[PDB]
Amino acid sequence: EVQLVESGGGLVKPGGSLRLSCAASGFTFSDYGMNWVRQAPGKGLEWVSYISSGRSNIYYADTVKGRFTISRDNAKNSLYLQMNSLRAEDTAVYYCARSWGYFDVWGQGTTVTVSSASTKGPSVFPLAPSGTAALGCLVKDYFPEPVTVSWNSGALTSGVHTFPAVLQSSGLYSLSSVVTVPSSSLGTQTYICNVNHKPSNTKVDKKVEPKSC
Amino acid sequence: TACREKQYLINSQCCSLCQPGQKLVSDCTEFTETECLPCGESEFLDTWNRETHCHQHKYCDPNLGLRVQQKGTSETDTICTCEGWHCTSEACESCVL
Amino acid sequence: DIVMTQSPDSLAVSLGERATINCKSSQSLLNLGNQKNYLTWFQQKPGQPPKLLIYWASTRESGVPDRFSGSGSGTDFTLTISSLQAEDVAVYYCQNDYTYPLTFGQGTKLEIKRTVAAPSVFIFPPSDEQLKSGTASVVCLLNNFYPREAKVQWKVDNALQSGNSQESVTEQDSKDSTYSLSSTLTLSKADYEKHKVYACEVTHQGLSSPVTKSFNRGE
């Protein structure tokens, strides 16, 4: 299918530099105009730059003029954004979006956090249960966003709720994922939450199970 | 017989022209219809035509003090202006302070 | 730079009804050449990129259902979602496709109005693992409720707590339109072993009366 896949985001110190990549598949990459578009956490969409399909003409948004540089490698089916001297107003999710007079296909985005601070991997704790039973995971004290939680490696998805993270007094982030399952399957079926926090290279599988007395 | 509006003649055959934004890849025949193809993302053709190649879009170098007044479409070329700045030539290929 | 300004900022519409989001631009978006108005509508469901709905102000993208309709001309346009559907819940953006820089509207959060549904409350004691580090998180879960207004009150040994808790709410579900909420009371291991009964009291329109769920520390 038509695909755009961004990579190269992460945590970065202010005034430092970062290079984003977008790997295209499913279409004649050389035929389309390629765009970068960003969305700061909580805010709306900001078009960042454009690169044409013909003689690869380039346009930029003023707010990145002089600092970002867009380019493409049609042989490699890749689009690139070299971001230089990142101020912290650059923190956003950066979207890859092809265009033929409108952005009709977008990537899933990669996150870029322009921060004073260091990465901190989350700590994962069970939420064990007592018709329907609820169980879950507390993913506590991490920086920066995002953590992604899955259940049974992607097999359990019905009734999963992963709550938006909250900012803790401590400066760090914490969230929880919960799921409701048949009570009859509590002794039989194994429930595992899988937490990935990329910027700290943290992959954790906590096996939530009912506590014994 | 003479050709109707928006048609062209090729070997005493009245063929339909190509609508704007589209270039010709095949003249018609007594029984098939003229075969056109859309212009490229960075390409345009502004008239009913039997051209075989689209035209490339105007680029608006910001070095030359240009802003894009209207973006290029497949049936219209880009339109460019200056922005603060004031244009030198009447055709406005470049600007100045 | 063109400026796209949307109205309303926020809109709640019942199922089946017609939603109306408006957009005004500072310039005109009419290409006098091909006579097209270069306005574009996007839908952004959460955790997803924006999804193209309508371009050229009125032409619908392929696969967009007929209940999505674009209208307008010049500097004033409209996206009209008629026969509103559970999965229509998103943020909608209009977008200047006329020139560079390409500029979006600020957003319109569409909510789906739904019948009353009571929360389903669960209480979660802290893990022994979390205690071994000196902190105690106690989670209350309000699962699948509507409308969004719900009061959660923590109580330790009937003592009404304040200040030591944080709320989190999921986005409105695309199938059943309910919300979900979690409240987390955070204490030190010290302060947490000083008491026995931990409870949360939920108050919501769908319930008959405020619901409490609790546990005794240790059992």
Nearest CA in chain B to C29: B70
C106 and C23 assigned to the same domain: yes
Nearest to B76 among C34, C97, C100 (CB): C34
Work out whether strand A10-12 and strand A110-114 pair parallel, antiparallel, or are unpaired: parallel
Nearest CA in chain A to B57: A54
Last residue of a domain, one of C113, C130, C156: C113
How far is residue A5's CA from residue A9's CA, in Å, rounded to a whole number? 12
For A79, the enclosing helix (H) or strand (E) is strand A78-83
Indicate yes or no: CB of B56 within 8 angstroms of CB of A33: no
Chain B contacts of A100, Cβ < 8 Å? 41
Indicate yes or no: CB of C99 within 8 angstroms of CB of B70: yes
C103 and C208 assigned to the same domain: no
Q: What angle do CA A63, A66, A68 make, to 5 degrees?
A: 75
How far is residue A99's CA from residue A105's CA, in Å, rounded to a whole number? 8
Chain C, 67 to 106: residues with Cβ < 8 Å from chain B are: 97-100
- A24 in Cβ contact with A93 (< 8 Å): no
Q: How far is A136 from chain C (nearest CA, A)?
A: 9
Structure tokens given for A35: 């765009």
Indicate yes or no: CB of B42 within 8 angstroms of CB of A100: no
Q: Which domains does chain A have, with CATH numbers?
A: 1-116 (no CATH), 117-213 (2.60.40.10)
Nearest to A163 among C51, C137, C168 (CB): C168
Q: How far is B34 from chain C (nearest CA, A)?
A: 22
C120 and C108 assigned to the same domain: no
DSSP calls for B27-74: ---SSS--EEEEPPTTEE--SSB--SSPEEPP---TTTT-EEEE---S
Indicate yes or no: CB of B69 within 8 angstroms of CB of C38: no
The answer to whether the bond into C147 is cis (omega within 30° of 0) is yes
Question: In the block, which residue shows the tokens 């819940």?
Answer: C89
- Candidates C107, B67, B21; CA nearest to A100 is B21
How far is residue B23's CA from residue B89's CA, in Å, rounded to a whole number? 32
CA atoms within 13 A on the CB side of A47: 27
- C217 in Cβ contact with C192 (< 8 Å): yes
Indicate yes or no: CB of C104 within 8 angstroms of CB of A45: yes
Chain-centroid distance, C-alpha B86:
27
Q: What DSSP character marks residue B84?
A: -
Structure tokens given for B39: 């212009």
Q: What angle do CA C171, C174, C176 make, to 5 degrees?
A: 100
C77 and C67 assigned to the same domain: yes
Structure tokens given for B50: 């039997």
SS (H, E, C) chain C: CCCEEEECCEEEEECCCCEEEEEEECCCCEECCCCEECEEEEEECCCCCCEEEEECCCEECCCCCCCEEEEEECCEEEEEECCCCHHHCEEEEEEECCCCCCCECCCCEEEEECCCECCEEEEECCCHHHHCCCEEEEEEEEEEEECCCEEEEEEECCEECCCCEEEEECCCCCCCCCEEEEEEEEEEHHHHHCCCEEEEEEEECCCCCCEEEEEECCC
Residues B21-58, buried b or exposed e (16+ Cβ, 10 A)? Answer: bbbbeeebeeeeebebeebbbbbbbbeebbeeebebbe
Chain A contacts of C127, Cβ < 8 Å? 125-128, 138
Last residue of a domain, one of C113, C139, C173: C113
How far is residue A147's CA from residue A150's CA, in Å, rounded to a whole number? 10
- C125 in Cβ contact with C147 (< 8 Å): no
C72 and C149 assigned to the same domain: no
CB atoms near residue C74 (< 10 Å): 14
Indicate yes or no: CB of C141 within 8 angstroms of CB of A134: yes
C122 and C92 assigned to the same domain: no
C96 and C174 assigned to the same domain: no
Structure tokens given for C172: 């409105």
Q: Note whether C124 contacts A: Cβ–Cβ < 8 A.
A: yes
How far is residue A4's CA from residue A24's CA, in Å, rounded to a whole number? 5
Nearest to B69 among C33, C34, C99 (CB): C99
Structural domain including C74 reads: 1-113
Q: Note whether A102 contacts B: Cβ–Cβ < 8 A.
A: no
Chain-centroid distance, C-alpha C149:
13
C144 and C209 assigned to the same domain: yes
The CATH number covering residue C13 comes to: 2.60.40.10
Structure tokens given for B17: 């022209």
Chain B partners (3+ C-beta pairs within 8 A): A, C
- Candidates C169, C177, C201; CA nearest to C117 is C177
C9 and C89 assigned to the same domain: yes
Q: How far is A167 from chain C (nearest CA, A)?
A: 9
Nearest CA in chain C to B68: C100
C10 and C59 assigned to the same domain: yes
How far is residue A62's CA from residue C179's CA, in Å, rounded to a whole number? 39
C101 and C152 assigned to the same domain: no
The answer to whether the bond into C125 is cis (omega within 30° of 0) is no
- A127 in Cβ contact with A135 (< 8 Å): yes
How far is residue A100's CA from residue C30's CA, in Å, rounded to a whole number? 18
Query: Three-state DSSP class for A108?
Result: coil
CA atoms within 13 A on the CB side of A84: 7
How far is residue B23's CA from residue B55's CA, in Å, rounded to a whole number? 10
How far, CA to CA in Å, does C208 sit from each of C117, C142, C152, C179, C182? Answer: 11, 15, 15, 19, 21
Chain C contacts of B69, Cβ < 8 Å? 99
Q: Bridge-partner residues for B12, per DSSP?
A: none
Indicate yes or no: CB of B70 within 8 angstroms of CB of C34: no
Residue A185 sits at φ, ψ, to 5 deg, of -95, 15
Last residue of a domain, one of C68, C98, C113: C113
Question: In the block, which residue shows the tokens 């209940």?
Answer: C67
Q: How many domains does chain C have?
A: 2
How far is residue C211's CA from residue C196's CA, in Å, rounded to a whole number? 19
C161 and C96 assigned to the same domain: no
